[PDB]
């Protein structure tokens, strides 16, 4: 119940939202149908439009007018944004030369530069170049401020997930807004774009920037705007708030534009109808900058121009229908469109089997434009599993396509030409970032970065301590003139043991054999030095990774590789090796085909055993350091140590062998040597974090050998590829992956073909950031470089996307 008989007199765009049944005057009241009776008359004035004219200059103040051209308007903070231009011979901000803003130039009584977040729905990254001729205000922010070529959204590339990620620094799986549509089985409640459930605070997890600000004594404007408040009025409201007294004035504000998303859905991302929405957004930016300039705030405020996601060409005719695959289609509920999520129509249906649904959806049509996944098998880079609101079955949809349950869903609802929601590495889904103001750098381009990082930077801009989030605080310090965040490297929790030769061959009863009994003081001291770490500076380029949890492990040195060997998991946490451009690939000799050798530095009790692999008819083994890349026939024996062995499904070995035998040497040739760190990952509860021993769901039959869920590799070289990886003076280049350790290649529809036709495509899909691997392993990499720690944090957040320009 709303007692709408209260009044908005003196309350228009109140920041403190008053509680029912008292009627509301805030920028959301319209959305809750709760505004006081006189809200439109008092708060949404339109009389005489939005622009001063020659005739209105020095006019008598008429309080019915939308904005003012009277002599008192600047003191009152309610001038039309073009007042000084029309009435005082001033220039529009866009016509002024760019001048470096070295220091905040703020009015007396400003404690900190305000932040204004100018958020634009569906603003695709390529609009900055393709629309530059029609967006002069935005082009001036972009060229004079700090900009990225693009900013990577979160998956799914939908509105609410991305806006709430911007506000919180969290993955959707953690903030809980995992789609524009959601069912929460614990609440038994549905979140929809239309209707009231979405306003319930139980959907919205983490701590958004406006709450972080308020809790630390920093006042915030209300970020959400009702669609019916015109953009001109949102801008005049922000400018009025900025004119409040020091004790009442917010330090942080958001503007939101429904464009260009709204038009992009109707006309496609580059439809000729898209020019006018881009012009209209640019005019709004011009109104804000002219308005700041009038208030002497244009060299005081930090402005962020940011999008939520891009926009792709999508039409009704590019729809896959589940009714073409499933006999049982009425037994499922599909969340449809540019992604799919499937659950049982009824939890009382005992016959519902997700295994049968996945199999019916797997590689059934030659050009099939979606791929089914159990959510724990999705690429780890999506971080899209650890939430009860994410259905177990997921459909990753090809760019330009939709999935729907039945044809009647598509033509009983063509109209639309654009959509978004696809995989967040897709070029069409990329969005924009520009930072302009005293705290941002001047005329600076920064590399592309992920929107999860912005919450930390917005906290840096406001002097706030950020709530715990998925950003890497410091990874964006290169955007900032000042207020940088200078973290310390995490403390190593476990120190390694450095075992020497402690066990005799005959103490091992592992069921292992090797034809290695083939026999010199020249090269007997040489092998001793290799085992004491004489080549370690060649194979461990960036220091040993730090172990950030309590465990028992050993450093093992060899001629060609170094490893941190876990006594708890009976395998390496990490294996490190350098392959020069000149390295040669060799075969596994016939005599060593099934060779596994005891490691005399490591107790039989802390070793794997071959008999477990022989007995396990599903499980085989591979090697973390590839025998194919041994430096010499004698060094190759080291690669067959039981301490280099890891459990591998035969289906996965096809992937691993091709990576090790073909791709490592290819990368070394292309990059002028590579350093590789490889290892296992255990994430049985799909939370993106290292499992403890007691979370492991699968062992090699009859053993305590745990089965990884994933295998990682981090492949580092010199950004200046004229310098070899092992002699690099400057910045580094990295590519990484987290390959799912699966007992089939059902993910790869072309897997019956030679590995050269499908393994690289699989590895590209499972590209990762070093930071993703850190979360999954509890390791901290790049501890010992020449480089600034902030530069290393940027490197650790890099994602190699394999997309074109
Ligand atoms: C991305 O960044 C985020 C933020 O840093 C990381 O998320 C954190 O991960 C931590 C580890 O998973 C997690 O810590 C847990 O917190 C529990 C208390 O949580 C509540 O309070 C916090 C603080 O106010 C709040 O943020 C939480 O919010 C979550 O839950 C609500 C639902 O009520 C959601 O609205 C909100 O969206 C958020 O959901 C997300 O997190 C939860 C898990 O907390 C997920 O289940 C959701 O799917 C969603 O992803 C909560 O309101 C605390 O109880 C936990 O403690 C257990 O574990 C410790 C281990 O140290 C153990 O020693 C304790 O005894 C305890 O065990 C007991 O409980 C077990 C579970 O019931 C039980 O099995 C045992 O038998 C024991 O009795 C734990 O400390 C932290 O909450 C989240 N924070 C957020 C915001 O998500 C995330 O990891 C990062 N991602 C990556 C890849 O790095
Ligand atoms: O329903 C909507 C939008 C609903 N609101 C979004 C939030 N918004 C707003 O003012 O957010 C401001 C804001 C909030 C936050 Cl958390 C963070 C910041 Cl940086 C800024 C008001 C409109 C919509 C829009 C586009 C869509 N495309 C599509 O397929 O479905 C769509 C639905
Ligand atoms: Ca959107
Ligand atoms: Ca885990
Ligand atoms: K086996
Ligand atoms: Na296959
Ligand atoms: Zn949209």
Residue numbers in the entry: 51 to 463, 468 to 573, 576 to 861
From the primary publication:
Autotaxin (ATX) or ectonucleotide pyrophosphatase/phosphodiesterase 2 (ENPP2) is an extracellular zinc-dependent enzyme that converts lysophosphatidyl choline (LPC) into the bioactive phospholipid lysophosphatidic acid (LPA) and choline. LPA mediates most of its biological effects through six G-protein-coupled receptors (GPCRs) known as LPAR1-6, thus stimulating a variety of biological functions including proliferation, migration, invasion, and survival of many cell types. ATX has attracted substantial interest over the last decade as a potential therapeutic target since the ATX-LPA axis was shown to play a key role in a variety of physiological and pathological conditions including fibrotic diseases, arthritis, glaucoma, and a number of other disorders. In order to confirm the binding mode of the novel ATX-inhibitors with different cores and modified ZBGs, selected compounds were soaked into apo-crystals of rat ATX and their structures were determined by X-ray crystallography.
PF-8380 (1) was one of the early ATX-inhibitor tool compounds published by Pfizer, which showed inhibition of LPA generation in vivo. In order to obtain a new set of proprietary ATX-inhibitors, we initially used 1 as a template for structure-based inhibitor optimization with subsequent removal of liabilities identified for 1. Basically, 1 can be divided into three parts, which can to some extent be optimized individually while keeping the fit of the molecule to the active site of ATX preserved. One important liability for 1 was substantial formation of reactive metabolites as observed by glutathione (GSH) addition to both the benzoxazol-2-one zinc-binding group (ZBG) and to the dichlorophenyl moiety. In addition, the 1,4-arrangement of a carbonyl group and charged nitrogen of the piperazine core could potentially result in some chemical instability. Besides this, metabolic stability of 1 was found to be limited and solubility was determined to be very low. The structures for 10 and 13 showed an identical binding mode as the one determined for the seed compound 1, with an interaction of the ZBG with the active site zinc ion and a good fit to the lipophilic pocket. In all cases, the oxygen of the carbonyl group of the carbamate forms a hydrogen bond to the backbone NH of Trp 275.
